[PDB]
Amino acid sequence: NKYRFIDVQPLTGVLGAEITGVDLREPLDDSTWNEILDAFHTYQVIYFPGQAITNEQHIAFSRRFGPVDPVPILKSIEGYPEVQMIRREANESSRFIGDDWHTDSTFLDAPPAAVVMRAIEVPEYGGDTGFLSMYSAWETLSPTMQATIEGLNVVHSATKVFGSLYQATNWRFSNTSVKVMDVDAGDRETVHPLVVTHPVTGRRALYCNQVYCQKIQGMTDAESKSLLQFLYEHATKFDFTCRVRWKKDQVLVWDNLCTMHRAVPDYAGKFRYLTRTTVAGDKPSR
Amino acid sequence: NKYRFIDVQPLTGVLGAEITGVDLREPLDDSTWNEILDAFHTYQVIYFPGQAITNEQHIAFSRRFGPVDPVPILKSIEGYPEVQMIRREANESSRFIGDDWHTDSTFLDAPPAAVVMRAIEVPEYGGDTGFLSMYSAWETLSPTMQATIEGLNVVHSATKVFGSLYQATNWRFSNTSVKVMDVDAGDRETVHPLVVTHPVTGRRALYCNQVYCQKIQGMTDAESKSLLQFLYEHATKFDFTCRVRWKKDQVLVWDNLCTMHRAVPDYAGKFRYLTRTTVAGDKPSR
Amino acid sequence: NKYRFIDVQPLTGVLGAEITGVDLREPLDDSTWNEILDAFHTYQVIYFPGQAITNEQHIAFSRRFGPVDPVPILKSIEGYPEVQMIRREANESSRFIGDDWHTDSTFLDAPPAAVVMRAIEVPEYGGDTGFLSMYSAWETLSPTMQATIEGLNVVHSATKVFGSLYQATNWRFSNTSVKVMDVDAGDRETVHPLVVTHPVTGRRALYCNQVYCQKIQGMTDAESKSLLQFLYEHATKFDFTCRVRWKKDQVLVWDNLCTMHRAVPDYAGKFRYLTRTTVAGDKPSR
Amino acid sequence: NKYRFIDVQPLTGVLGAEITGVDLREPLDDSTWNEILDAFHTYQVIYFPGQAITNEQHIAFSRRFGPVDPVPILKSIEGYPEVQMIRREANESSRFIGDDWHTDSTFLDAPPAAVVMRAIEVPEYGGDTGFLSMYSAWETLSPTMQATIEGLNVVHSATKVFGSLYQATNWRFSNTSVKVMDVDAGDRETVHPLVVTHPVTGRRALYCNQVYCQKIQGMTDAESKSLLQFLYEHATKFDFTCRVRWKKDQVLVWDNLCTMHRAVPDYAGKFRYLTRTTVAGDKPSR
Numbered sequence A, B, C, D: 001n002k003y004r005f006i007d008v009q010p011l012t013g014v015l016g017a018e019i020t021g022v023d024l025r026e027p028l029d030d031s032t033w034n035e036i037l038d039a040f041h042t043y044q045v046i047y048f049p050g051q052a053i054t055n056e057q058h059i060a061f062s063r064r065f066g067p068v069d070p071v072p073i074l075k076s077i078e079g080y081p082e083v084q085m086i087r088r089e090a091n092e093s094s095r096f097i098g099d100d101w102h103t104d105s106t107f108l109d110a111p112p113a114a115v116v117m118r119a120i121e122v123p124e125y126g127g128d129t130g131f132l133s134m135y136s137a138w139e140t141l142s143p144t145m146q147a148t149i150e151g152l153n154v155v156h157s158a159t160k161v162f163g164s165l166y167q168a169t170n171w172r173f174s175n176t177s178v179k180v181m182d183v184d185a186g187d188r189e190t191v192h193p194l195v196v197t198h199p200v201t202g203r204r205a206l207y208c209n210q211v212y213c214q215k216i217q218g219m220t221d222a223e224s225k226s227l228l229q230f231l232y233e234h235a236t237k238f239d240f241t242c243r244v245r246w247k248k249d250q251v252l253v254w255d256n257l258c259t260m261h262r263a264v265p266d267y268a269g270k271f272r273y274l275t276r277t278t279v280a281g282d283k284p285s286r
């Protein structure tokens, strides 16, 4: 709109934008990179159709957003530790990775700031990714509700994904993309604010997710359950979401602090493979 | 035990006490009155079996607790505007008065401080009254949850009892004990703190009830519902309750700021009649 | 793929398809019509980008699906009582029409079978419509849960939209697209099965929606709320939805028996105008 | 009332009765035993104040109700395997036994029919036992709701009490009354009807409890959770309960099929000791 070096097409009135008119196989001039970063901060999830980039170009483009660092759970392609896989063979019957709303690796003291995902080979239909804005979840709380919860922190851990709760369950991820982890690493706790300030935009976002949040720190289990449940229902209303469909060589970047996302498992029996590099963040803070 | 002019038998480890060794038809000396008042403050609901008092002695004893003032909704006995009736004819099929956890007349800017209820004729069994302590409901919230809610206020009105919500439904009280009221008086709102300090003991109590609380002030309807539902489920756990069985001429006093009570409707087809005088309070405050 | 006279691009693995290779301004031969109808039955919501049709061609094409009959609540365009408007002026501050999951006019003894909606002028982004499959909501109930509910009926009425519950609240639709209605018509109840069989495909679908369903027939209010809340949370999981973005002259048909839909209100301050003709149905049945 | 050999004083209009005018240290003539059994079947929980019986008289009186057989979890007094203890030392800080609504040992293929509990040494106040009627929970379901759930079965196991869920938790029972159990015995599942017919009275009772019920058989976890939650809330309404206060040598009998009960933990710091013998039952059936 204001953009002169890239073409940007917002996806909904809440978040998401398609970006075209740029070739990510080539270096970006300063002005072009500035518009891309501005679109990233405005729209929170941006995607570029039709970008046939090499793995190393994927690494370098990811590096423009900040330091790259893989997440603990995913396997990487041979010869690139930074390039992890979200790969599901046609014949799998295991749990689909990321099939509840979450944001990535929040059990870390410093979760990722962003992730850059690229479609290698995906079905003609099925396997969309949903996103939602945690800026919008926060802004649509009343001032009274905001003031009530803004001093709270939450305890996060990977116990349901690769810790003792996981090991107690029957339903596994396959070993196609997921590593065997140490149970104790799965159960290690960290604490983050329930309401964070984005370190670049200064905007505030609600920060909780059902995959990694165990409870509100200092609360009883029943108090915490009641509050977190309301927040999850509030944040995942359909009005705050968008939905991204993938095609081969679509490159997408999401902000891992101010958004949540989830896989859509509607392609059972079909091969699906995307790669991703993760961009490191600093300690979430209030 | 520490009591030397009255005999006090606590009812549970949470609230409630029977008081004997005293004849309420006779004046009470300062020593005996000081212990009764102390037992009222410690136990929150106190009752005196076997007190065959006149209506005037009921008014005079009620007056020892504070100025007496009837509640808006109840009919009074002929010749005593201060002595109101909780009366249900055997064959009534209407709603049972007070059959949800509440405390009285909290839609008033200044609800009653206490009520003094006396059994005239009651069933051999059935018609007990439940009580619970809102001191205990407050004290068993975590320090974190207490800090989270202590600054909130709640909007109260009588809309479901004698205002527009009542008029919209089809389940009525009979005219045995309940007056016809103005709908606009039913709908008038007041605001009270969600957490109050008792003006005599200085102790804090949770202050919300599903009968008169409409919503948390300043919150959205979904936010208010979520928090108030948790607080009602928390406060009405069986562990925080006691149950009083009535016998003819039992006289009982409850603190209308720090308890809630409810009628038990398990005597359909049997006559029940109690009288009560209400003791005025000041504006609930933090 | 099996389609040889139209090109069909399914939208997700659950429901929804784009149809191209056809010009709806021209008559359709039997072969092309049979495939369109087949795609409508398989995919439940179908849409045709780029169809600059007249209002008469919109009526004629709608008529191929079944007899056309407007819904009670919407204003129609001058000169075409069958062509109703979903129109929102940029500066409206009123409630957004259809902004909760529902299916249309289910308070009728015989709700519509289908609707055909056409974009006249819509925002560059914002104003998408969500859809979900009630075939999928039904199929993913366990066999045990299916047997448990299949004999139940639900009482429907328009009370919250244009009856006494609507009149009691303070959030209105504007008069741009919505007629003034009789309150007694708003409150009139009908009964439908909770689980219906589609009269053409023979497949079964869950049939309840929070906008028009009042309660499960024969149940208490607390029993009905409990079951209907579970079914709404089950049916509206993100996995069962698809999301359609509009562009000028996109024409879309949805099956009003086996889907639910909702408006997304993310375009406040921007003009939006679609027209629709509704296709009459028969009484929903087991 | 009709009783001529015993004096019976019902406790509420729902369940419970005090029985006097009999000495349980002596054998009962046929007529006296017939009235006691009739009062047991009518009132579901009966209690006899002031019965200073020996352990063997307790055994023999229990034997009149049917075969005696201890429950798996509780320690017994030396020299009487049939006489188990519910004993809590003044200094305990562990979990209170039986502090949620339940009925006993329903993880067994044939749970107890009844239990006979006798106060040895109890506090002056605190440590009441609540009871409720599952006949009343069932009768207050609508016919429609009754027909909906009457064919369902439920899976029960002791996993939360002495199985893997217990071992996962932090909060233990003390070893004062509770035995060390095998985890596998804790996790063994059985199936009972959700609605049972009492084998003597022929009356129907709802049969589920949060302590031992894992899920509705054949349902998904979310479907089962939703239904069981509603039933627990419905059954434990205060209106369906009574509350029994203990005094030394009170002997009480409860029907373990048609009632639920729970301990009240309001006596922290005070010694409490009751003994009990359990009477074996047959397989719950519909």
Ligand SMILES: C[C@@H](Oc1ccc(Cl)cc1Cl)C(=O)O
Pocket (backbone or CB within 6 Å): A071, A073, A074, A097, A098, A099, A100, A102, A103, A104, A105, A106, A161, A178, A211
């Ligand atoms: C890769 C990603 O891992 C998951 C996130 C959510 C869920 Cl449900 C499962 C996994 Cl493995 C992450 O958290 O970084």
Ligand SMILES: C[C@@H](Oc1ccc(Cl)cc1Cl)C(=O)O
Pocket (backbone or CB within 6 Å): B071, B072, B073, B074, B097, B098, B099, B100, B102, B103, B104, B105, B106, B161, B178, B211
């Ligand atoms: C007497 C009492 O009135 C009621 C309280 C609760 C309920 Cl559910 C009904 C009434 Cl009339 C009061 O609030 O003063």
Ligand SMILES: C[C@@H](Oc1ccc(Cl)cc1Cl)C(=O)O
Pocket (backbone or CB within 6 Å): C071, C072, C073, C074, C097, C098, C099, C100, C102, C103, C104, C105, C106, C161, C178, C211
């Ligand atoms: C046009 C449509 O009307 C509505 C549907 C849902 C809602 Cl929330 C509002 C309206 Cl006016 C209908 O039911 O036919």
Ligand SMILES: C[C@@H](Oc1ccc(Cl)cc1Cl)C(=O)O
Pocket (backbone or CB within 6 Å): D071, D073, D074, D097, D098, D099, D100, D102, D103, D104, D105, D106, D161, D178, D211
């Ligand atoms: C003795 C009794 O055991 C319990 C019942 C409920 C609860 Cl919460 C705990 C126990 Cl040990 C039983 O089930 O037979």
Ligand SMILES: O=C(O)CCC(=O)C(=O)O
Pocket (backbone or CB within 6 Å): A086, A097, A098, A099, A104, A127, A128, A129, A130, A261, A262, A263, A264, A276
């Ligand atoms: O497969 C997808 O769409 C998303 C998976 C995901 O959550 C992730 O990669 O962290």
Ligand SMILES: O=C(O)CCC(=O)C(=O)O
Pocket (backbone or CB within 6 Å): B086, B097, B098, B099, B104, B127, B128, B129, B130, B261, B262, B263, B264, B276
């Ligand atoms: O009838 C009872 O037990 C209590 C009635 C009541 O709530 C009241 O008098 O305010």
Ligand SMILES: O=C(O)CCC(=O)C(=O)O
Pocket (backbone or CB within 6 Å): C086, C097, C098, C099, C104, C127, C128, C129, C130, C261, C262, C263, C264, C276
């Ligand atoms: O405006 C929309 O997207 C849908 C409106 C709707 O629900 C309807 O026309 O019935």
Ligand SMILES: O=C(O)CCC(=O)C(=O)O
Pocket (backbone or CB within 6 Å): D086, D097, D098, D099, D104, D127, D128, D129, D130, D261, D262, D263, D264, D276
């Ligand atoms: O201690 C009590 O009041 C009851 C304990 C109990 O549930 C039991 O003995 O099975």
Ligand SMILES: [Cl-]
Pocket (backbone or CB within 6 Å): A054, A056, A057
């Ligand atoms: Cl390269």
Ligand SMILES: [Cl-]
Pocket (backbone or CB within 6 Å): B063, B066, B067, B068, B069
């Ligand atoms: Cl006065």
Ligand SMILES: [Cl-]
Pocket (backbone or CB within 6 Å): C063, C066, C067, C068, C069
């Ligand atoms: Cl027609």
Ligand SMILES: [Cl-]
Pocket (backbone or CB within 6 Å): D054, D056, D057
């Ligand atoms: Cl003996």
Ligand SMILES: [Co+2]
Pocket (backbone or CB within 6 Å): A098, A102, A103, A104, A261
């Ligand atoms: Co993820």
Ligand SMILES: [Co+2]
Pocket (backbone or CB within 6 Å): B098, B102, B103, B104, B261
């Ligand atoms: Co009252």
Ligand SMILES: [Co+2]
Pocket (backbone or CB within 6 Å): C098, C102, C103, C104, C261
């Ligand atoms: Co609609």
Ligand SMILES: [Co+2]
Pocket (backbone or CB within 6 Å): D098, D102, D103, D104, D261
């Ligand atoms: Co027990």
